[PDB]
Amino acid sequence: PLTALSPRRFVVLLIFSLYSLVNAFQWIQYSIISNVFEGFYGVTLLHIDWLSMVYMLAYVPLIFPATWLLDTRGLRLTALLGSGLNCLGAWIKCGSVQQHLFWVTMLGQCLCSVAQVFILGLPSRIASVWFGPKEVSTACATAVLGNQLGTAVGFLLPPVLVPNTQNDTNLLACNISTMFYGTSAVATLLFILTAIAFKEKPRYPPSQAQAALQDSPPEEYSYKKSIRNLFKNIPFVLLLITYGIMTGAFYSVSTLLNQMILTYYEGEEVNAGRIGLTLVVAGMVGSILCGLWLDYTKTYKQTTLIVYILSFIGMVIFTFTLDLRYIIIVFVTGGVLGFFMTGYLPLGFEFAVEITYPESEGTSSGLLNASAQIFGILFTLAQGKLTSDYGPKAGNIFLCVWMFIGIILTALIKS
Ligand SMILES: CC(C)CCC[C@@H](C)[C@H]1CC[C@H]2[C@@H]3CC=C4C[C@@H](OC(=O)CCC(=O)O)CC[C@]4(C)[C@H]3CC[C@]12C
Ligand SMILES: CC(C)CCC[C@@H](C)[C@H]1CC[C@H]2[C@@H]3CC=C4C[C@@H](OC(=O)CCC(=O)O)CC[C@]4(C)[C@H]3CC[C@]12C
Ligand SMILES: CC(C)CCC[C@@H](C)[C@H]1CC[C@H]2[C@@H]3CC=C4C[C@@H](OC(=O)CCC(=O)O)CC[C@]4(C)[C@H]3CC[C@]12C
Ligand SMILES: C[N+](C)(C)CCO
């Protein structure tokens, strides 16, 4: 066949990497300053925990219908739906600047959650469709890095944008409205860019594989059968459990970092945001380094076990060092912990893709993400309860025990 590369692909990626960013910024914006919103709305921290967890709750059941819609309708419809849903959720958030309108913020968060189901699975498909064989890996990696950067921006900005001025309600409302207006304007702009430039497919397949895929007639795939076949493979089940445990621990830590820091350090929301940003940035660095190191080594189990062990060590040291009352210690421990845990995720995802090579990669990715969402919900609930009742240390020890169980499971994996 005939294959060629078009410049538009870059734009198609860039816009995505932008509107996948904003969604991430909206996932944690409430959690990082959860105390401020708790004071403003007169609600409990469980409300902010649910604001964080609605992403997982919505993603869990809608992953497979979204995959079917993407496979049948195409990429353009999925991108349009994601961008429009994100923009609409932000606009709904704009109308939630009243102390008695928490439900409006909840509705906006639900809309962003529904957008996430379309947003999350895009990277691999966009990279395959629009980029060549020597750039597909780079395109997917930079898309995931854009999502991670959005998470980091959500960690960093809100603490500074909205100071905890509980004394005056007008100033807090003004700051919240300003943040919501900025986010909604950015989301609407990115939706306009997606509607204008996000083409369904390039004129020529970027690579021979994409040309063959286009030439080959579409064939229906039974997602239920694929899931049933995948569940048979015990090693895949173990890898799924371990990846879910790791991702859920990361999500719970991200959600409850504000509470953990506020328990010991008072009036340090900006420092908490900086700690989260350092954690996520070190996570990206570790992800890149681990990906390249895995590509060079060709070993999929020893690296996974070592990374899991180091992540558990980081979690334990963070737990036993957070109470020392030194912010530098918290910065360092969070940085190393995030490095290890966030670098684990790409390794586990690639291992799952490789081990299940006969099976469809999309179904495996969807199952991995669903397990991560469920584990994150459970871990966030348990750790929040423990922190509220017994303090951060109890929930941190619970997470450490879960990480040790994950190490055991990873050791039991065979391949
Ligand atoms: C990781 C462990 C602890 C939990 C794993 C749970 C999964 C087995 C769940 C999570 C999401 C579920 C899915 C959520 C939504 C749907 C769509 C649903 O669609 C229909 O009702 C029509 C299907 C058809 O077209 O035949 C079918 C079941 C399915 C795939 C579910 C099958 C079971 C899944 C994969
Ligand atoms: C559209 C899709 C994404 C699903 C949307 C589901 C949410 C709207 C639901 C799921 C779980 C619900 C929460 C489950 C439990 C609680 C605790 C509940 O707390 C109490 O009743 C006691 C409060 C106190 O301690 O004073 C308040 C409602 C809330 C936050 C619920 C609010 C609505 C939530 C977030
Ligand atoms: C695989 C799953 C099912 C394991 C679940 C285990 C949990 C039930 C464990 C994990 C961490 C434990 C907690 C770790 C630390 C403490 C502090 C402990 O504090 C005390 O009152 C005694 C010690 C002291 O004096 O400080 C009370 C029990 C508690 C909350 C533990 C209760 C039981 C927990 C939640
Ligand atoms: C993918 N996020 C980290 C943005 C949300 C998880 O529920």
Swiss-Prot record:
Changing I245T: Found in patients with sensory neuropathy; uncertain significance; decreased choline and ethanolamine transmembrane transporter activity. The chain holds residues 99 to 513 of 555 of the full protein. Residues 27-44, 95-101, 162-167, 265-268, 323-325, 390-391 are extracellular. Ethanolamine binds at Q116, Q373. Belongs to the major facilitator superfamily. Feline leukemia virus subgroup C receptor (TC 2.A.1.28.1) family. This is Choline/ethanolamine transporter FLVCR1. Glycans are attached at N167. Keywords: Cell membrane, Disease variant, Epilepsy, Erythrocyte maturation, Glycoprotein, Intellectual disability, Membrane, Mitochondrion, Neurodegeneration, Neuropathy, Phosphoprotein, Receptor, Retinitis pigmentosa, Transmembrane, Transmembrane helix, Transport. Changing Y55A: Reduced transport of choline and ethanolamine. Signal peptide: none annotated. Disulfide bonds: none annotated. The keyword Ion transport does not apply. Residues 73-74, 131-135, 198-233, 298-299, 356-363 are cytoplasmic. GO terms for molecular function: choline transmembrane transporter activity; ethanolamine transmembrane transporter activity; heme binding; heme transmembrane transporter activity.
